[PDB]
RNA sequence: UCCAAACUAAUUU
RNA sequence: ACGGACCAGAGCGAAAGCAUUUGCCAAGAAUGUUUUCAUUAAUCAAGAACGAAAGUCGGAGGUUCGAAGACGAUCAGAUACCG
RNA sequence: UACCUGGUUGAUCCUGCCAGUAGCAUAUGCUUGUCUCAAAGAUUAAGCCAUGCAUGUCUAAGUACGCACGGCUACAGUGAAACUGCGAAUGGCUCAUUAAAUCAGUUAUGGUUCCUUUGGUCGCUCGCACUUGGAUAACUGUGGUAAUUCUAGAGCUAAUACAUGCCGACGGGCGCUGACCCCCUUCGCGGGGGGGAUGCGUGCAUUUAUCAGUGGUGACUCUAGAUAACCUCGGGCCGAUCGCACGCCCUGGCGGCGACGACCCAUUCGAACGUCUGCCCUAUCAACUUUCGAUGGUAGUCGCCGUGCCUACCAUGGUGACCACGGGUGACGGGGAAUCAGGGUUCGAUUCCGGAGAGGGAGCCUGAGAAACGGCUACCACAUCCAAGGAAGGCAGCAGGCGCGCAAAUUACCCACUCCCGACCCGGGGAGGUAGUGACGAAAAAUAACAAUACAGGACCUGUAAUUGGAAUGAGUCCACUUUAAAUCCUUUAACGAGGAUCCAUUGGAGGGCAAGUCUGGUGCCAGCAGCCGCGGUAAUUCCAGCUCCAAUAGCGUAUAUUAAAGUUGCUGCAGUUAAAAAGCUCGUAGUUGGAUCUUUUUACUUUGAAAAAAUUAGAGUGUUCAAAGCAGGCCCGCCUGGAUACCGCAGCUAGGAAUAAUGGAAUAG
RNA sequence: UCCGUAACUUCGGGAUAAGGAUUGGCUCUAAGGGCUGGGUCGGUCGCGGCCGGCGCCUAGCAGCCGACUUAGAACUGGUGCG
């Protein structure tokens, strides 16, 4: 090309947001945000292919014109915002408060939180450094900056900022033990405890996680979020718990439950 | 226009490539500046993500660095004695980034008589034997004791003329910074100057 | 240890 | 020029090939070995040496035999067989 | 389904090919009731193109004095046009170019740019503002021209266009300078401790030198700090802008929310250039490259940056039988597709990812992004109007036409769905969607069923009939609903609609391979058939016909590419005494392969973990009426539930294993 | 001067094959040599030496001298230049 792209076809789009082959031919092609492409969630498929509450494209920017979507505390209006994970999309006047964080088969689950729950989310610290007159700064895995954070909070920790207010209320170090999910690869949505940080100097490092039945399994560092202080994850898990059941596991509670 | 591709190239074996595509914009190349001495002269060049480089045709005025009292001054070029990468590029008076000048003394010879009061490169009065109280006349005194600059860059202050190095790169920036040359590195280039006459 | 070459196109098992 | 008989389902040589006597020169297999070295090997594009007979080019020699050639026969023909 | 059969002979066993056989995909032939999906000018000509369309865009929120409309005093409110802004670099089409190139996996940018979006930052600088300047379009008015989306002259008038530019913060602080005062000593000299006027400088970004060693990295010449400065007139930043609601303090003075813009730092979408490994045929291509850069060093120039990218000065290198270089390709690469026991063989123009080009080349403008072609500028080729003066061109965009050919569709409707762009809830989209043409192909499935007789059978059951009987339905016709942007079709339901149920099933065959006749008539080595062996010269099981029969059936022949058959290319797996074939013999470098030996250092190997685009394939779940499909669905105010898993050569990464296979340690002990 | 050279061949030749470019003036720039001295402390008297403590040019410097030739570049002329 001889600049950027702007469409996305409807086969080359990501496989979790679970579209189909025969609606059109294109996808809805997420603007720039905060979230990668290949990671984010956009606006219009999440209330239109998830939710049911309108049935066309049309229908998904009635909705959102008339300001009744807010993502973090904030109103956003464009259909194709990149909401990700650990985002919370305040409806407000259903009053539903959702919070995207992905199943245990690595899509985004329909998740809803408490009206107390959606004050805040969670924040992976990206990047550490200083500015003008010495003064520090934070890079969380969303595209937010932080002036003047505490001396203690290095990389890839996770912290816990207020929405509407932007500021750091309490923080996770990246520990052996603490509590954490799987956001990219293999093990998408996967819950466990950090077993193992094995570090590899110049390539990637690898974390091995322990799972809540005993199972086990690595994931690189890149792709571990770190959601809990030792075992109490602090945010409300979904439906399952983040526990990968395997295909005769989940056949038998499907066969269960007839 | 001027391409700096690659394709163009033969191989490491030395076998042609054929080309596959069109020269693109990205490749391109400008011709060079060729910065002379003279009345300032620049020119913008609107580059790449709408940024734009300073190139200079024609400078006068530069800023050194005196370096061994983290003493800069804006002083005036008077013109070019050597070039490593060309011999002629110092008879045509060409100001590149390692290229070797000589400057004017003058801003160096009036702060060096302010801060350590005695003379450089002397055979008015007020700024050298002044009336100094008893406190401020002490600290002249430590300052005494470490004003001994080498004999051969107290040769440059009597002609007037520093030999100095450009460090800047003029045709990117517009600018011509550098430092005077002292030292080892003086006594280098004065011997192929000498070696040239 | 004398010589001694050739053989319907006219077909049906 | 040629080395009969002896001369063989015998020998030697990488193969082509190799036979009178004696001398000289260098080689080599097999056997023998409680010597020595200690894997130095096997097969091999490119490359290399050898390679009957006929043929080629120089010298020498030319007895026998003998392509080509000339005749005598035989033959329907016989520029072939035989002389 | 890991399959063979005919053909050399008088007969036999062989080697061996030819011929069958089965898909697949292109053309074609004959035929064709229904209905669901669906390829479709790639192959030859990346040949040439008439006409039309395919890219524009306005909010309460940049600029309305167009009465073009319009309500009751700078400006109501709509608002054409015009400026300004933004997009037009995406999409779409085609496969010519291109053989470590493109591309794929893998990594890097600690070697770079990045409009927008999102988050920071935006009184950090000591130095007319209650608003500054000029211009221009729309419009009006005079025109010119054969001509065009040509434009001239004159009068107006705007800004978030274009310029210019201040107050406030703002009290100073901090560095340097140092007049000067002051205190404690001192025989004195001297020495010691504060205050300090007046001057110079001061923030980010930029550029260079130097000093010190807040946070980070495997690793910085990183980030941050300190100092000396500089800062381009073709000029870095530091708001002379707009709308909502409008309150609050004592004319004044403050205040809520937005929009728009900003140098810079992140971020997002990327982009570009690098790392490692991987490609078809060819030796009747064996040496290639290099003072016209080939390989490397030093310094620069250029560039967004690393770099022989380029220049100067040097060095003489670099690549190659492990196939360089050269040539070819009926070569865009890949995901993939057809065939298939296991291995393979062939294909991939073609809807997804990446690349390329817009008649051929070349050069550029604008912009964040282009060497752009529904942008300019040339020249070549071609071609269009012309009053001969000139002007305009680019369908490998959708349609359409010509040409080329064995070979490929309507100059249809629509932004309703999918999404994209814009100032935008309103506009636009030949992207896309829907119809038409559609035996490319794939799924489903009519052309009769029954009963009684007449008869035949079989050990009460069954068959045969130009006999008979009323039962059942679609095909078709056809109202209406539904469907949808409006339709059409399917689905639904009235009305009709079957006896020779004339509402008629073809395509190939009948010696053998190979399912099916020694029937009848004609022809007489003729006409003809026949893939192969063959047939025909007067009783043709083979031709031409009739009768019968067979095969598969709304399909079936035929040509050609190709796969299996083919263990007839042989890795699995072939041969080489006489059938095709082992070089005359030996040496010999590459290459290939290498004896035994030990517990009973680097790799290869093996196992595992990551990270690996979907679609396709395998496969889970699910009654599209079934099936091909599809990702749906299911259960009585709503509730429940799916949108799995596997596989993804090699290379690179990770942790276990230590047999096998290489390799390494102490012999002048260095 | 710099490039570039076929058929044919007794492999020597053909060959100055053929074919093309360049050439002035001026101002510079590189490159190509030769002769001398590398003597550290008077250890210390027959401003010079007599025998040796005293030292590291050793990747060669420094002085003087000297021909001719080749290559490159800028400028310059009414495109002229063997
Ligand atoms: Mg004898
Ligand atoms: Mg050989
Ligand atoms: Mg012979
Ligand atoms: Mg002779
Ligand atoms: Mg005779
Ligand atoms: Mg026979
Ligand atoms: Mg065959
Ligand atoms: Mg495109
Ligand atoms: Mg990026
Ligand atoms: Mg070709
Ligand atoms: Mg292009
Ligand atoms: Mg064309
Ligand atoms: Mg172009
Ligand atoms: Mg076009
Ligand atoms: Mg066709
Ligand atoms: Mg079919
Ligand atoms: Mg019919
Ligand atoms: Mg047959
Ligand atoms: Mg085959
Ligand atoms: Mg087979
Ligand atoms: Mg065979
Ligand atoms: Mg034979
Ligand atoms: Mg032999
Ligand atoms: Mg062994
Ligand atoms: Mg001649």
Not at chain 1, 36 to 64: H, M, S
Not at chain 2, 56 to 63: C, E, I, K, S, Y
Request: include cysteine.
């Amino acid at each position: 090309a001889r600049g950027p792209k702007k469409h996305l076809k409807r086969v080359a789009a990501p496989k979790h947001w679970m579209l189909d082959k025969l609606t059109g031919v294109f996808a809805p092609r997420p603007s720039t945000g905060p979230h990668k492409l290949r990671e984010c969630l956009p606006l219009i498929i999440f209330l239109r292919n998830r939710l049911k509450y309108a049935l066309t494209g049309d229908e998904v920017k009635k909705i959102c014109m008339q300001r009744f979507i807010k993502i973090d505390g904030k109103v956003r209006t464009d259909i194709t915002y990149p909401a990700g994970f650990m985002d919370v999309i305040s409806i407000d006047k259903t009053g539903e408060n959702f919070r995207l964080i992905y199943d245990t088969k690595g899509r985004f689950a329909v998740h809803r939180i408490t009206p107390e729950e959606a004050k805040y989310k969670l924040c992976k610290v990206r990047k550490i450094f200083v500015g003008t007159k010495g003064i520090p700064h934070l890079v969380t895995h969303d595209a937010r900056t932080i002036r003047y954070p505490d001396p203690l909070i290095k990389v890839n920790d996770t912290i816990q900022i207020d929405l509407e207010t932007g500021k750091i209320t309490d923080f996770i170090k990246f520990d052996t033990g603490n509590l954490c999910m799987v956001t990219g690869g293999a093990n998408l949505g996967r819950i466990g405890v950090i077993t193992n940080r094995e570090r590899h100097p110049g390539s990637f490092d690898v974390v091995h996680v322990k799972d809540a039945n005993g199972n086990s399994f690595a994931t690189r560092l890149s792709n571990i979020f770190v959601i809990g202080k030792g075992n109490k994850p602090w945010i409300s898990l979904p439906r399952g718990k983040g526990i990968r059941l395997t295909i005769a596991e989940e056949r038998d509670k499907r066969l269960a439950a007839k | 226009g001027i391409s700096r591709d690659n394709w163009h190239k033969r191989r490491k074996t030395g076998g042609k490539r054929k080309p596959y595509h069109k020269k693109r914009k990205y490749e391109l190349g400008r011709p060079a500046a060729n910065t002379k001495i003279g009345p300032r002269r620049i020119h913008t060049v609107r580059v790449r993500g709408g940024n734009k480089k300073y190139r200079a045709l024609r400078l006068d005025v530069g800023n050194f660095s005196w370096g061994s009292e983290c003493c800069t001054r804006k002083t005036r070029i008077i013109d070019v004695v050597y070039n490593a990468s060309n011999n002629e590029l110092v008879r045509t008076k060409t100001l590149v980034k390692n290229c070797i000048v000589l400057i004017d003394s003058t801003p160096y010879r009036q702060w060096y008589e302010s801060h350590y009061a005695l003379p450089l490169g002397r055979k008015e009065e007020e700024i050298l034997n002044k009336k100094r109280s008893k406190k401020i006349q002490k600290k002249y005194d430590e300052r005494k004791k470490n004003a001994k600059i080498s004999s051969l860059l107290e040769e440059q202050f009597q002609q007037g003329k520093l030999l100095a190095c450009i460090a800047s790169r003029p045709g990117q920036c517009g600018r011509a910074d550098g430092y005077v040359l002292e030292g080892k590195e003086l006594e280098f280039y004065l011997r192929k100057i000498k070696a040239r006459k």
